[PDB]
Each structure stands twice: as structure tokens, then as C-alpha cells.
Design a protein around this motif. Structure first.
Motif: not given
Lengths: 102, 54, 108, 123, 119, 101, 298, 32, 123
Positions: A8-13, A39-52
Motif C-alpha cells: 500500500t505504501a509503495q502504491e501510494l508513493l 521494521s525501521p525500513s517499513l516504518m520510514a516507508l509509511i512515514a514518507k507515504s503519509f508525509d507526501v
RNA sequence: AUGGGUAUUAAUAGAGUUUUUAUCGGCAGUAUUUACGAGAUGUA
RNA sequence: ACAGGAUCAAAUCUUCCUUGAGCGACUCGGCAGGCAAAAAAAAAAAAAA
RNA sequence: UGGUUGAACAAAAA
RNA sequence: UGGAUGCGUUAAAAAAAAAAAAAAAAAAA
RNA sequence: GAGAAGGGAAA
RNA sequence: ACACAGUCGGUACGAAGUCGACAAGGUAGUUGAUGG
């Protein structure tokens, strides 16, 4: 699951499609419920998805609650993303311990 | 024995040495002498129990 | 040789002029149930608890039988077992809920 | 009839050491002696399985007592046998043939087939 | 070792003729017979008395005393190993389940490993 | 010690549509709630709730185990998990992919 | 599996090939190798009740007592009766000693039962049965029961199974009187049961009515007196008769209730069982005490 | 030894109601 | 009294020594399959529960313990003021391991977590 | 040993093997049964 | 299964907690055995080749 | 009210 | 070398006993 | 509160 | 079939979805009625 949230995060990005309020609410609820497994990587991915898309519903504070535990396994890219997102999204002088951990 | 196994597992000076992979040989085995085994004959008696049904 | 067992009227007054001519009990006075002395005054009864399970549809009642009449409790239990308290009652199925009754030793 | 009645009526019953042939005991003994004489003369008889099982023991007895070669055993064999041909065959062929055989001079073979006319098992 | 590895107890807990860790000495009568026959064979071959015992068909075993001594030492070591392992397993079983196998008390067909029949 | 009625309750009348749907819907709800669970406590609570529903299958057991691993493990001695472990041992020989278990 | 005649002849020739009789010792000593390490003595309380044991009926013979009185006696053998497990309240919900007796060929044994026997470290057993007992009377697993469990002179409660007599009519199964052999009696009535119930008023035949059927094969209990014991062969000679065939299983236990109160109140008994002391010598054969008064007095 | 209804059952009985709901006779007058 | 007691006393006499060889009901609150001593606050409570389930008197339990325990433990029992079983049940005195073992033999169940000895070793 | 190159006992990945009676006659031919999983979200 | 867990950490031989009652108990899982033959009062008695 | 109680008694009451 | 029966011998104790044929938290096979 | 004298069992 | 063996009735789809859905939530598409 975690894989579905990552997809979902990758699709949002990948695209700039505007999602629905129901999607935002369900995604935020699931992320908060699974926060302790991130994990830190998935957490960063989701944070970026929300921030974008510029959506804030306490997701940043919820992720910061658990991030100090996941920092110890963070790569350089994840560290960059987490620093960039949280430094701007967290209230000033809110969680200095998190920045110290980073 | 358990004591000797533990000794080897604790030792930091003992190794299985090989300059090249082909050095390693199968462990040497000493084969004891044979003697009658009525116990093994009994086990065979049990094993052949249901041959008529097969 | 054998003779009749000792009943409840062998251990109290008998008043032939009264409707309740003698007090009758399930056991003798010394054999009536009681709570262990140090393990007493630690519990209380809500007397009735109901559990609703909308997914399976099997609901539960839990009732305290201490001090209740056998027939008076039995009629209520039969109502609950049949499900006649429900608006979708049907005579052709066991349409009621499940029932647990405790303290049957203390029935009167 | 009903087959399960065999189980029902044999529950708790012993097998008879001797299978009884039709007729009275003297007739049964005469029949057994006659068939023993014929078996001696022919070296093999096709019979019903029970009858072979019954006559085997008398054949064994005949050979066992004929081998002993005493007046008493000779009289026993005489009481068992009928014909001079059977006597000659026994003494002059079977006894020398079994001189070194301690026992077990006969065999019964189940043919695993039912007789056509009356469905009698054969051997 | 720093993290101890735990051996599996299934070899002890599997009771069948295909599990030696449990059926090695079972039944005790035949285990005793095996030990007795091994001892007799060793005494009648590795300690010859000048006559053919005839306990088994002949074998071309070594006859030099130098070889016989080493064979005897090997057999003594094997005997000690078997005895010690049986003792240890019996002690473990006693401490675990209180199970204990003893010698027969009476002369009976079951002690002889035979069925009780009318004869 | 035990409940008085332990004989199987064999209904002697055929169920209605709603009754049979309620009887059979555990096959959906169990996996749905295992997926929705984000904690070992929730996973074990759901399994215990559906403990009496037969007949469990190897994919049910595997989904439970996978969800437990993902959520982050649990005490392997908790009686709720002992239910799962005993069921796995019971149906061991029927597993195709026993190594995955 | 031989023929009928072959079996008959082997039965006839059986006597010629019996083993020579063994030599019976007068006294024997027991070492630690024959005593279970956890077997220890106990002094009973009022509720203590010991376990029974299993034996095979072997035969019967006549023996003379001290006064010269002849008694018919039945010989039973405790053929390697061994404790295999203990039932306990917390582990099984009740208390008892599980005992196995006999020997069964492995080619006849099944694999799971073979595993049980291997766990017990015993040869394959023929039969297994429980004996309910008190908690203090539980015996250790692996102990082998001896005839010394029973003191001669004691009364024993014995249970068994009666023999099968096949299908029998009322006359032979229940001793019905039948009818006269003469005086016009009809053939069907000579051994008939007669009437079998009342008439139209009740309109049934009552349950448990005595009629023809397959006779025998019932669980029967009796009392016996322990007349003699021989520890060498684990033989127990019990006064009287016992149900069953020769070689059939028999349960032997202490007398109870009226019999115990009237006969066993003063005979001391070993609790939980006979507990040998290593190094001590014991008699091999023990007889019951003699009658105080002369049986031939009148 | 070493959502009020839901909380009480979890604390004392030691299991979770989940979607199930419980009430006792003490609260009947609120529904009467 | 005379040579005969009251019939009530005789019936109570007969019923006083009733001994049942079964636990035949699972609706009873008594020691059964799966008994756990830790379900009770302490060893005294567990012992009282087990003894009452068995249907035995304090005096009989104490007598059995005294008559079956070792000599030194018997001397300690004699020295102890009052009745040891009563004090244990009241939770006033802590028993020894041998005393607890004899009590457990009497009542049929353990009173503390029973320790079994295994022969396992990590390599 | 200002200490673990350090002392002792690897059968170690292999503790593995068919007894006794028996002069001679006889049976041993067949069927049922274990994955009522969605291998699989395939090895990251 | 001493299998998992806690602790200023246990006599050799576990101080405790968990294991709803470690599947009723103990075993087996190429386990289990209906019929035939051969025997056979209930039962028992043949390893395979 | 008391195990006091087989066809036997004691306490209290009005 | 044996079988059956009583005209022979033994017991008359246990009934929560002797014993049995359906382990059952399995509520729509 | 009654041949409540069909069964259960009620003030 | 409990049945002179017949008669009157007799199961109420989907959400088994989900990028779901007035006042509070402490976010469970959870909750509001109830002190002697």
C-alpha cells in the motif's frame, strides 16, 4: 499484514492519486495497530507515504512511540527518511530522546 | 562418553585439520567380534509376525 | 433387626394443629450443608448472569439456586429452555438458550 | 436353513475325537476295516475329506503294528485286515519300504474342490 | 561450548524393536543369555584348553598369545561398556518412573519365557 | 471436576438456513479474525473461542502459526497455544508440508 | 494344529516325556537383586486394604493335615505376576495396582502392547488386570508378587469364570422337575418347563424367567482357606473348589466383611506385602495351623 | 500461593469476552 | 447401657466405618483426576481438603503418621506441643519432608509440587 | 600464566550381526486400512 | 519433554512459575486384521523362509 | 431444643 | 491314558461386589 | 389452594 | 416412522463485503439504561 502495508505504501508513493477518507482512516488504524511489528525500513516507508500526501492523524507520534526500539537496525536510507520526516512533523521539543537515539 | 564429548566441545585447542578438502577421511571404525544373539533372533521373530497377511 | 430411618420429625417439635406440622429438611441438622469456616464471607452472589453471543447465537443464563423452590425454579428454567420469552419462538426446535444452575444443594 | 445356526449350536461344544460314520458301531468298524484293506491294495484312495482324516489313523496303526513282528502285533494286524492280497502287500512291500520310517506313513491331501453330484469336499 | 545443545530424548522415549536405545537389553532373560554365551565363547576361544569346544562351527581366529592378549583386552572393554550402560539406564529409569526389573523369584513357565498350557 | 453433560448433542431435526449458516461460519470468521489479529493474545483468544468448532485443517493450523510468528511469538506453554500444539501433533501425518510446520 | 488322532495319541504319550521333578529347598535367602529398592513396610490404619493377585488354576489333589484329616485342595500358580503401574487420584482419578501375568509369544503380541512391555522392562504378558487398594498399600512398579503375600490359615475371597456347558434345556440348566416318565405323559412334556407365567391379567412373561439357553460362563466368587504355600514355585494350595478350567485366570484377595470379621481378625498379615530382609532365611513351604480339637473325637 | 463487565470478567475469570456481552440482575431496573 | 445399644447408635456404628472404593461422581468438589495443591492458599488447607475428601479423622491420620514415621521424627512429634496434624491444617507449624511424605501416602495426593528426577544433561 | 594457544576421556555423522528344539505326516490362500490441505502466500 | 519462562540463581538430585487434567493412562503410526486353510467346550497352542 | 430416640425420655411453651 | 454326572466334594463371603457392549468439552457426520 | 383424584410441582 | 402410516404447516439469498460508517472515544467500525 506487513507485506500488504508495504504494498500500500509503495502504491501510494508510485502515483499521486488522491485516495478516499475511508482509505486514509483504515490505513491509519491498521498502521497504528501494527506499529510494534514495523521494521525501521517499513516504518520510514509509511512515514514518507503519509508525509507526501500531507495527512496527519497522530500517526507520527504513534510511530515515534516505537521507533527508538527499531532504530538499532536502521540503514542509512531509513535513517535519512526518518530524520527528514520526524524533524518536520513532530512538535518542537516533543521527544528529544528519539532524536538522541537517531 | 558424555564427559569426553563435553571435553571436545569445550576444548579450544583441538580441531579437525585438513590442508585440502580431500584430506578428510571417514572415521576409523574397529569392528568387534561376533557371538550368538538370541535377543536379535527374538526381535526378528517379532518383525516377521504378519507375513501371511501381506 | 432393621427398622425405619430417622426422619426430620424425630428431631424437633410436632404441632398437629398447624398446617406446617413439623419442619422437614433434606438432612439432619448436623448434616446440612455449610461453608468451610475460614473460606467463608469471601464470596457474594449476583443471583443471575446473562451472556449474549450474537455470532454463534447460543446465549447463556447462570442462576443461583440458593433459597429457591424446586418447582418455582423449574418453571422458569422450562420457559428459558423452550425460548417462549423470545419473539421468534418456534415449537418445533429447542429454541431457548442454555442454562446453568448453581447451589442445587440449597434448594428448598 | 440358516448358516449362523452352526455357530449358535456349536458355542461351547467339543470336537469328537472319532468322526462317526453312518450305521451302528459294528457296521462302522467293518466299513473302516474294508476301506483300510482297499487303501493298502491301491496305495491311494479318493475320499471325502472327513473320511480320509478318519481312516488315516487306522492306516498308521496297521503299519505300526505290522512292523513290530511279534505274534501279538500280528494278531492285531489280522484283526484289522480282511484280504490275503492286502496282507501280502502290507507285509512284503510296505513293511520293508517303511523299515526305517519311525512313524507317519500316510498323508491326506485336500483337493479344494466340491464333488459335483452332492457338493462333498474331496481329498 | 557457550550455548549448550540439548540431545533429543526421543531415542529413550521410543519403545520398539527398531529403537536400540530402548530395546538393546530387552528382554532381560535373553540379555543374560547373550552375555553368558559371549563369555563362554571368549573363554573357549581366546583361552583355549587344547580341545575343540564345538560350541560353534570353527573359525580361523588368531592363536598367537600377543594377539590373544589384545583381543582379550578388547573384549574386557566391551564387557565393561555394556555393563556400565545397562547400570546407568536402569538407574535413570528408577529415578524417573520408579520402574525396576529384578531377577525371577520362582521357577515358572513365564520366567522360562514359555506359555502356560495343560501339559 | 467436569460438566455433567458430556454426551454428544446430536440434533434430531434438520437445521434452518440461519442455523446452518451460524454453524458453518466459523470457517470464514476464524481465518478472518486470525488475519485481523495484531497480537498473540488476540490470536490465542480467537483460537480458544473457536476451540470447539470442528473440523480444523492443516491450513488453519499453518495460518495460526504464521500469524503467531509475524505478531512476534508467544509463550509456547500457554494452554491456548498448547491447544494448537496438541492439534498439530494429532494431525502431523496428514500435513503435506510438515517441514513448514 | 495337528489332526484329532495325532492330538489324541500325543495326549496318551504325554506322560512318558515329562521333565524330571525339581529339588525343592527347605529354606531360601533373598538378596538385593530380588527386592525392589522402594519396597518398604507399612503399619496399616483402619481403612487400609491390600491388593489382590492373579494366579492360574493348575489342578487339584488330596492332602492330609496334622490330625490326619484329608482335604481336597486346588493348586494355583502365580506365574510371574508383576506390578506394571500405579493408579493415583491426581494422575488417574482412582487408586489401584495394575498387574500383568503370564507370557505371550511376540509373534502374537501387537506393536503398541510390545512398546508397553518394553517400557515395563518385562517379557510380553498374557493377561493384565487391576486391583483397587488403599493409598498406603500401593506397591512399587516392577515388584513381583509372591505367594508369601498370603499367610496360611487366612481366608481369601476368590473370583473367576465358570466353565461353559453349551446349550442346555431347563431340566439340566436349572434342574426343573419335568413330568412323569409314564402315566400317559406326552413326549414333548417329559422334560418341558411347564407353564411360563400368569394369564391375561398381567399378559407378559416376567424378566429373568428361567428357560433354556447357553449354560455356564458366569463370573463366580467363593471363599477359600489358604491351606499351604510353596515359595519356590509360587504355588498356593487353597482348600475347596475354584471356578474355571485348568489354566484359567483366577483373582485371589483377602476375605472381606463377615468372613474377615469371623476368620481373619487375629491372623497377622504383611502390609503392604511380604517385605523380605536381605540375608534372612525363610521357609520354602508353609502349612496352615492345625485344629486345636481332635476332629476324630466322636 | 504466589466496559465494567468485560473488565471484571477479564480480571477475575481470566478470559476475554471478545464480542460477547454480559449483564447481571443488579442492572435490571435500568431496563425495566 | 444394657447388652444392647439404641438402634440409632447401631446404625451410626455401621455407617461410621463406610469405605467406598470409588470416586463415582464428577459433580463432587473433592480430590480427583488433575488435583493441584496450589489451588489452595497453603499446605494446611490442601491437607484438610484432601483428608475431608478421603473421609478420615484427624486422630487416625496422626496415628498413622506417628506409627509409620522414623524414630527421630517420632521423637520430634512427641516433643511438639499439641497435635501436629491439627497444627499443620491450621497453618501453625511447617512439616518436614518425611512428615509430608507420610501425609501424602495417607491422603492419596501430593501437597506440594512433586519433583521427579530426570537424567538429562546438556552437551 | 598481570591468563585461557590452558593442561582432562570425542564410539566422533555410524555401539552395527538370527536363538533353541527337531528322524518321519499336515495348514498357511485372500481382502480392508493412514494426505477428510488450500504443496502454495513455492526456497528472500 | 524438565519442554518454555523469572530471579543479587536453587545440596549432590530444579528455588519457583507455565504446561485448563502436558490428549483418561501407557504405547503404536509399514499401526491395526474381516474371510479361507489348519485347529478348536471359554480360551490357548505354528516367526519368516 | 438435645443422635435423647425400635413400643423409651429430658428442656421450653402456652 | 481319560471323560461326564451326583449318590461325591467345597463355598454361601463381596453389592461403590464380581462384570460389562458404546473415553463423552463432538452443539447440525 | 380446588376429585389438584392425568403428570410435574407452586403460595 | 412415537403414527389405520395420514393431515395442517414447514427453513426467508447477499456483509461470506470493507480503499468500511447525533453525541463520545482514548480508536475496539468500541460506547450512551442502571445506587439500596
Amino acid at each position: 499484514d506487513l507485506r500488504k502495508l508495504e504494498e500500500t505504501a509503495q502504491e501510494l508513493l508510485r502515483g499521486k492519486e488522491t485516495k478516499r477518507r475511508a482509505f486514509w482512516e483504515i490505513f491509519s488504524k491498521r498502521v497504528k495497530a501494527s506499529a510494534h511489528m514495523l521494521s525501521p525500513s517499513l516504518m520510514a516507508l509509511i512515514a514518507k507515504s503519509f508525509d507526501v500526501h500531507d495527512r496527519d492523524t497522530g500517526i507520527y507520534v504513534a510511530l515515534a512511540t516505537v521507533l527508538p526500539e527499531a532504530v538499532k537496525r536502521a540503514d542509512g536510507r531509513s535513517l535519512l527518511t526518518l530524520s527528514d520526516v520526524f524533524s518536520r512533523r513532530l512538535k518542537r521539543d516533543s521527544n528529544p530522546h528519539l532524536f538522541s537515539t537517531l | 562418553s558424555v564427559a569426553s564429548r563435553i571435553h571436545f566441545l569445550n576444548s579450544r585447542t583441538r580441531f579437525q585439520t585438513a590442508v585440502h578438502a580431500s584430506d578428510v577421511a571417514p572415521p576409523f571404525l574397529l569392528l568387534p567380534l561376533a557371538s550368538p544373539r538370541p535377543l536379535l533372533a527374538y526381535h526378528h521373530r517379532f518383525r516377521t509376525r504378519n507375513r501371511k497377511r501381506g | 433387626s432393621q427398622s425405619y430411618p430417622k426422619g426430620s420429625f424425630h428431631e424437633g417439635h410436632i404441632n398437629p394443629f398447624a398446617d406446617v406440622q413439623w419442619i422437614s429438611r433434606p438432612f439432619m441438622k448436623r448434616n446440612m450443608p455449610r461453608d468451610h469456616h475460614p473460606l467463608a464471607k469471601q464470596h457474594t452472589s449476583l443471583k443471575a448472569v446473562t451472556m449474549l453471543d450474537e455470532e454463534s447465537g447460543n446465549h447463556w443464563h447462570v442462576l443461583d439456586g440458593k433459597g429457591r423452590s424446586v418447582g418455582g425454579l423449574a418453571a422458569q428454567v422450562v420457559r428459558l429452555l423452550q425460548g417462549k420469552h423470545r419473539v421468534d419462538f418456534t415449537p418445533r426446535t429447542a429454541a431457548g438458550d442454555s442454562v446453568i444452575v448453581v447451589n442445587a444443594i440449597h434448594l428448598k | 436353513g440358516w448358516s449362523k445356526v452352526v455357530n449358535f449350536l456349536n458355542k461351547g461344544v467339543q470336537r469328537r475325537p472319532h468322526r462317526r460314520l453312518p450305521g451302528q458301531p459294528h457296521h462302522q468298524w467293518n466299513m473302516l476295516k474294508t476301506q483300510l484293506d482297499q487303501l493298502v491294495r491301491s496305495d491311494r484312495l479318493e475320499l471325502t475329506l472327513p473320511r480320509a482324516h478318519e481312516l488315516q489313523q487306522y492306516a498308521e496303526e496297521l503299519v505300526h503294528f505290522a512292523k513290530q513282528n511279534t505274534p501279538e502285533s500280528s494278531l492285531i494286524v489280522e484283526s484289522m485286515i480282511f484280504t490275503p492280497a492286502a496282507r501280502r502287500k502290507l507285509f512284503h512291500e510296505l513293511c520293508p519300504l517303511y523299515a526305517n520310517r519311525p512313524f507317519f506313513y500316510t498323508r491326506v491331501v485336500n483337493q479344494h474342490r466340491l464333488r459335483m453330484r452332492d457338493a462333498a469336499p474331496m481329498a | 561450548l557457550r550455548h549448550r545443545v540439548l540431545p533429543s530424548s526421543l531415542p529413550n522415549r521410543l519403545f520398539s524393536v527398531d529403537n536400540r536405545e530402548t530395546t538393546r537389553f530387552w528382554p532381560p532373560p535373553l540379555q543374560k543369555e547373550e552375555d553368558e554365551r559371549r563369555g563362554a565363547f571368549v573363554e573357549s576361544c581366546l583361552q583355549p584348553s587344547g580341545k575343540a569346544s564345538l560350541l560353534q562351527p570353527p573359525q580361523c581366529l588368531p592363536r598367537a598369545p600377543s594377539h590373544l592378549a589384545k583381543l582379550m583386552e578388547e573384549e574386557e572393554r566391551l564387557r565393561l561398556y555394556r555393563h556400565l550402560k545397562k547400570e546407568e539406564r536402569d538407574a535413570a529409569t528408577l529415578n524417573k518412573f520408579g520402574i525396576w526389573a529384578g531377577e525371577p523369584i520362582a521357577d515358572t513357565p513365564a520366567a522360562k519365557m514359555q506359555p502356560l498350557v495343560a501339559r | 471436576r467436569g460438566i455433567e453433560n458430556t454426551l454428544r448433542l446430536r440434533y434430531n431435526y434438520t437445521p434452518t438456513f440461519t442455523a446452518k449458516k451460524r454453524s458453518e461460519m466459523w470457517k470464514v470468521n476464524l481465518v478472518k479474525k486470525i488475519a485481523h489479529a495484531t497480537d498473540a493474545k488476540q490470536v490465542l483468544d480467537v483460537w480458544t473461542y473457536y476451540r470447539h468448532r470442528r473440523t480444523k485443517r492443516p491450513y488453519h493450523y499453518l495460518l495460526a502459526l504464521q500469524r503467531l510468528v509475524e505478531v512476534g511469538g508467544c509463550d509456547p506453554t500457554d494452554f491456548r497455544f498448547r491447544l494448537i500444539a496438541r492439534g498439530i501433533y494429532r494431525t502431523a501425518k496428514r500435513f503435506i508440508n510438515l517441514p513448514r510446520v | 494344529y495337528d489332526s484329532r488322532w495325532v492330538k489324541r495319541l500325543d495326549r496318551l504319550r504325554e506322560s512318558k516325556f515329562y521333565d524330571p521333578a525339581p529339588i525343592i529347598k527347605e529354606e531360601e535367602i533373598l538378596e538385593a537383586d530380588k527386592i525392589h529398592p522402594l519396597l518398604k513396610k507399612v503399619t496399616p490404619s483402619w481403612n487400609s486394604r491390600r491388593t489382590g493377585l492373579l494366579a492360574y488354576k493348575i489342578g487339584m489333589m488330596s492332602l492330609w493335615d496334622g490330625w490326619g484329616e484329608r482335604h481336597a485342595v486346588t493348586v494355583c500358580q502365580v506365574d510371574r505376576c508383576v506390578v506394571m503401574d500405579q493408579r493415583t487420584l491426581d494422575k488417574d482419578g482412582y487408586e489401584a495396582c495394575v498387574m500383568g501375568i503370564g507370557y505371550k509369544p511376540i509373534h502374537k503380541v501387537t506393536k503398541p502392547m510390545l512398546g508397553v512391555y518394553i517400557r515395563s522392562q518385562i517379557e510380553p504378558k498374557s493377561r493384565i488386570a487391576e486391583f483397587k487398594c488403599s493409598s498406603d498399600c500401593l506397591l512399587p512398579v516392577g515388584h513381583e508378587m509372591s505367594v508369601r503375600h498370603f499367610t496360611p490359615g487366612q481366608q481369601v475371597f476368590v473370583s473367576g469364570w465358570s466353565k461353559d456347558k453349551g446349550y442346555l434345556g431347563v431340566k439340566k440348566r436349572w434342574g426343573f422337575a419335568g413330568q412323569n416318565a409314564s402315566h400317559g405323559v406326552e413326549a414333548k412334556a417329559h422334560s418341558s418347563p411347564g407353564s411360563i407365567g400368569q394369564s391375561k391379567t398381567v399378559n407378559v412373561v416376567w424378566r429373568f424367567k428361567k428357560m433354556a439357553g447357553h449354560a455356564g460362563g458366569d463370573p463366580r466368587v467363593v471363599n477359600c482357606k489358604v491351606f499351604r504355600i510353596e515359595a519356590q514355585r509360587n504355588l498356593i494350595f487353597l482348600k475347596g473348589c475354584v471356578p474355571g478350567y485348568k489354566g484359567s485366570l483366577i483373582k485371589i484377595s483377602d476375605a472381606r466383611g463377615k468372613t474377615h470379621h469371623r476368620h481373619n481378625r487375629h491372623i497377622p498379615l504383611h502390609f503392604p506385602t511380604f517385605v523380605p530382609e536381605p540375608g534372612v532365611s525363610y521357609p520354602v513351604t508353609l502349612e496352615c495351623p492345625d485344629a486345636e480339637q481332635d476332629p476324630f473325637l466322636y | 500461593g504466589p466496559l465494567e463487565e468485560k473488565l471484571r470478567i477479564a480480571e477475575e475469570e481470566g478470559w476475554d469476552l471478545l464480542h460477547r456481552r454480559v449483564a447481571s440482575l443488579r442492572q435490571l431496573k435500568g431496563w425495566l | 447401657m444394657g447388652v444392647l445399644r439404641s438402634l440409632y447408635s447401631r446404625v451410626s456404628q455401621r455407617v461410621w466405618s463406610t469405605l467406598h472404593f470409588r470416586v463415582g461422581s464428577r459433580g463432587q468438589v473433592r480430590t480427583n483426576k488433575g488435583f493441584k495443591p496450589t489451588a489452595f492458599p497453603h499446605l494446611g488447607a490442601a491437607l484438610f481438603f484432601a483428608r475431608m475428601s478421603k473421609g478420615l479423622t484427624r486422630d487416625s491420620v496422626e496415628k498413622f503418621v506417628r506409627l509409620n514415621v522414623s524414630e527421630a521424627q517420632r521423637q520430634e512429634i512427641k516433643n511438639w506441643p499439641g497435635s501436629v496434624v491439627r497444627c499443620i491444617e491450621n497453618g501453625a507449624c511447617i512439616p518436614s519432608r518425611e512428615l509430608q511424605s507420610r501425609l501424602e501416602q495417607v491422603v492419596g495426593v501430593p501437597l506440594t509440587r512433586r519433583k521427579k528426577r530426570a537424567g538429562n544433561r546438556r552437551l
